[PDB]
Design an enzyme around this catalytic site. Structure first.
Site, short mmCIF file in Angstrom:
data_model
loop_
_atom_site.label_atom_id
_atom_site.label_comp_id
_atom_site.label_asym_id
_atom_site.label_seq_id
_atom_site.Cartn_x
_atom_site.Cartn_y
_atom_site.Cartn_z
N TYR A 136 0.83 -1.24 -0.20
CA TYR A 136 -0.22 -0.01 0.16
C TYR A 136 0.74 1.14 -0.01
O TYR A 136 0.92 2.22 1.00
CB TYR A 136 -0.89 0.09 1.32
CG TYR A 136 -2.01 1.10 1.32
CD1 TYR A 136 -2.95 1.14 0.12
CD2 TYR A 136 -2.11 1.94 2.22
CE1 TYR A 136 -3.87 2.35 0.20
CE2 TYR A 136 -2.89 3.00 2.53
CZ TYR A 136 -4.10 2.82 1.06
OH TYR A 136 -4.83 4.02 1.24
N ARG A 156 -1.24 8.19 -3.83
CA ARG A 156 -2.21 7.14 -3.25
C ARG A 156 -3.37 7.78 -2.75
O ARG A 156 -3.45 8.86 -2.39
CB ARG A 156 -1.36 6.42 -1.87
CG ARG A 156 -2.09 5.18 -1.02
CD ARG A 156 -0.98 4.86 -0.40
NE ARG A 156 -1.20 5.46 1.16
CZ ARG A 156 -0.37 5.67 2.02
NH1 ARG A 156 0.57 4.49 2.03
NH2 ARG A 156 -0.40 6.37 2.70
N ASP A 157 -4.38 6.93 -2.66
CA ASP A 157 -5.73 7.34 -2.01
C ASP A 157 -6.19 8.63 -2.83
O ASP A 157 -6.61 9.59 -2.46
CB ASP A 157 -5.70 7.50 -0.76
CG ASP A 157 -6.80 7.65 -0.02
OD1 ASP A 157 -7.95 6.74 -0.46
OD2 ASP A 157 -7.15 8.38 0.99
N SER A 161 -5.47 9.42 3.39
CA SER A 161 -4.52 8.41 3.34
C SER A 161 -3.38 8.42 2.27
O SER A 161 -2.92 7.84 1.69
CB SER A 161 -5.11 6.89 3.33
OG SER A 161 -5.80 6.42 4.44
N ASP A 200 -7.93 -0.02 -3.30
CA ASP A 200 -8.71 0.97 -3.79
C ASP A 200 -8.20 1.25 -4.99
O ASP A 200 -8.83 2.32 -5.90
CB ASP A 200 -8.56 2.25 -2.79
CG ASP A 200 -9.08 2.13 -1.31
OD1 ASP A 200 -9.93 1.13 -1.15
OD2 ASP A 200 -8.69 2.64 -0.16
N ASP A 249 -8.85 5.27 10.12
CA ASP A 249 -9.15 5.44 8.70
C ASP A 249 -8.91 6.86 8.35
O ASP A 249 -8.62 7.15 7.10
CB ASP A 249 -10.55 5.24 8.51
CG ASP A 249 -10.96 3.82 8.52
OD1 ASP A 249 -10.21 2.71 8.08
OD2 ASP A 249 -12.26 3.66 9.11
O1 LIG Z 1 -13.71 0.96 0.94
C1 LIG Z 1 -12.95 2.01 1.57
C2 LIG Z 1 -12.08 3.01 0.84
O2 LIG Z 1 -13.46 3.43 0.43
C3 LIG Z 1 -13.17 4.59 -0.68
O3 LIG Z 1 -14.31 5.09 -1.05
C4 LIG Z 1 -15.13 4.66 -1.87
C5 LIG Z 1 -16.29 3.88 -1.16
O4 LIG Z 1 -15.89 2.79 -0.44
C6 LIG Z 1 -17.49 3.64 -1.94
O5 LIG Z 1 -18.66 3.02 -1.23
C7 LIG Z 1 -17.83 4.75 -2.76
O6 LIG Z 1 -18.69 5.63 -2.25
O7 LIG Z 1 -16.63 5.31 -3.58
C8 LIG Z 1 -15.74 5.80 -2.80
C9 LIG Z 1 -14.65 6.09 -3.70
O8 LIG Z 1 -14.89 7.42 -4.46
C10 LIG Z 1 -12.20 5.60 -0.21
O9 LIG Z 1 -11.98 6.50 -1.03
C11 LIG Z 1 -10.79 4.91 0.36
O10 LIG Z 1 -10.02 5.95 1.10
C12 LIG Z 1 -11.11 3.79 1.31
O11 LIG Z 1 -10.13 3.07 1.92
O1 LIG Z 2 -4.88 0.35 9.30
C1 LIG Z 2 -4.16 0.06 7.96
C2 LIG Z 2 -3.76 1.13 7.19
O2 LIG Z 2 -5.18 2.03 6.97
C3 LIG Z 2 -4.95 3.30 6.07
O3 LIG Z 2 -6.15 3.46 6.00
C4 LIG Z 2 -3.82 3.91 6.61
O4 LIG Z 2 -3.58 4.86 5.48
C5 LIG Z 2 -2.50 3.09 6.47
O5 LIG Z 2 -1.55 3.96 6.95
C6 LIG Z 2 -2.80 2.05 7.48
O6 LIG Z 2 -1.47 1.34 7.40
NA NA Z 3 -8.86 4.67 3.31
#
Ligand SMILES: OC[C@H]1O[C@@H](O[C@H]2[C@H](O)[C@@H](O)[C@@H](O)O[C@@H]2CO)[C@H](O)[C@@H](O)[C@@H]1O
Ligand SMILES: OC[C@H]1O[C@@H](O)[C@H](O)[C@@H](O)[C@@H]1O
Ligand code: NA
Length: 358
Positions: free
Chosen positions: A83, A88-89, A95, A135, A313
């Site tokens: 990850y 990222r994210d 994140s 993701d 989270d």
């Molecule tokens: O499932 C965890 C991750 O969710 C991500 O957002 C998603 C969400 O889960 C969906 O239900 C839908 O709403 O789309 C979202 C993405 O636009 C989130 O962005 C991640 O950070 C989470 O780890």
């Molecule tokens: O808890 C597991 C992972 O969750 C993610 O949402 C965080 O960004 C990470 O730093 C963490 O390692």
């Molecule tokens: Na997340």
């Protein structure tokens, strides 16, 4: 299928989570809840390699697992999450990570993979199972209108390909992340998702070590719901088993004998969200079904705990650069610290609300 990676192995218990849990259980005042909380350290979880600074820790885990296997007459299995993509994210703020595409992101990621491979290569007696980049691929199916994701698409695909190609050379069993039923399980998203997963699998050479896909990572959906959660209105695939039963045949139509793992670590309590898209520190969540290879589905190799319950989270502090407003919603537990750090009050509720009980 015939080769379930967990059959015949003992799972090495995460020392990182064990230390978090041990410290947390001492701070729980009710003595009965404290004992139940401490027992969570004996439940196998995935350890996240969310920074290059954690790669030396991986080496220690592999070496400890190797010695434990020799001592106890067993073969040991280490569970990890990769990850650390650059940018990222991409569809959220909480994140964001250490690498950016604009600053040599892909080259930094390749070096991160190379260092992981170099550790794994030294302990061939230990089996490794890896979840690849939660993701990332789901964002490329539904979030290409998000400019950060659109600009990251080619880098994401190259980095995931580099991980799959090189981890296969050292015999790592891999599950690529595949979102969850509320994300990719909508019927209209299944075909685009299948096309992307099969392209990634083909680009990496169709290695048999690419076992399949992981679902529900860090989310809260039921594997098999008694009745649909009201947040699911409009989607016939209202739990993970419906999503998997709909997606798995499409991957078969392409020649991939794919199997799945499903996170249930925070799924013990259903019907706690206001909207399906609320993902951040959802209030009232409880630990769910414990990891097991007795899954009830031909497509599912194991129920697992991927996201370690208690690790946050995302922060609710609107002054942080990683503030995401999803983490200040009414269904989000607050105040919350930075993503990845310990959230003690959240852990205590996960223990109290666990279903089945601890
Ligand atoms: O499932 C965890 C991750 O969710 C991500 O957002 C998603 C969400 O889960 C969906 O239900 C839908 O709403 O789309 C979202 C993405 O636009 C989130 O962005 C991640 O950070 C989470 O780890
Ligand atoms: O808890 C597991 C992972 O969750 C993610 O949402 C965080 O960004 C990470 O730093 C963490 O390692
Ligand atoms: Na997340």
């Amino acid at each position: 299928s015939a080769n379930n990676p967990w059959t015949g192995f003992q799972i090495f218990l995460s020392p990182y989570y064990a230390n978090e849990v041990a410290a947390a259980a001492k701070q729980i005042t009710d003595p009965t809840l404290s004992s139940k909380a401490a027992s969570v350290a004996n439940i196998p979880t995935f350890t996240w390699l969310d920074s290059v600074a954690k790669i030396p820790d991986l080496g220690t885990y592999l070496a400890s697992a190797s010695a434990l296997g020799k001592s106890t007459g067993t073969k040991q299995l280490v569970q990890i999450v990769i990850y650390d993509l650059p940018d990222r994210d991409c569809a959220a703020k909480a994140s964001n990570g250490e690498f950016s595409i604009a600053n040599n992101g892909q080259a930094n990621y390749e070096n991160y993979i190379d260092q992981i491979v170099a550790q794994i290569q030294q302990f061939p007696d230990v089996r490794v199972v890896a979840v690849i980049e939660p993701d990332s691929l789901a964002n490329l199916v539904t979030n290409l209108n998000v400019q950060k994701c659109a600009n990251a698409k080619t880098t994401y695909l190259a980095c995931v390909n580099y991980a799959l190609t090189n981890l296969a050379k050292v015999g790592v069993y891999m599950y690529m992340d595949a979102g969850h039923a509320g994300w990719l399980g909508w019927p209209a998203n299944l075909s685009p998702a299948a096309q992307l997963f099969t392209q990634v699998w083909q680009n990496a050479g169709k290695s048999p070590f690419i076992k399949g896909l992981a679902t529900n990572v860090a989310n809260y959906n039921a594997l098999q719901a008694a009745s649909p959660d009201p947040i699911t209105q409009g989607n016939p695939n209202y739990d993970e088993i419906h999503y998997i039963n709909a997606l798995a045949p499409l991957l078969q139509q392409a020649g991939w004998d794919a199997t799945f793992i499903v996170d249930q670590g925070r799924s013990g309590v259903q019907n706690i969200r206001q909207q399906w898209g609320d993902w951040c520190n959802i209030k009232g969540a409880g630990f769910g079904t414990r990891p097991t290879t007795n899954t009830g589905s031909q497509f599912i190799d194991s129920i697992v705990w991927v996201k370690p319950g208690g690790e946050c989270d995302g922060t609710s502090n609107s002054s942080s650069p990683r503030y995401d407003s999803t983490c200040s919603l009414p269904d989000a537990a607050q105040p919350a610290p930075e993503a990845g750090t310990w959230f003690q009050a959240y852990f205590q509720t996960l223990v109290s609300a666990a279903n089945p009980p601890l």
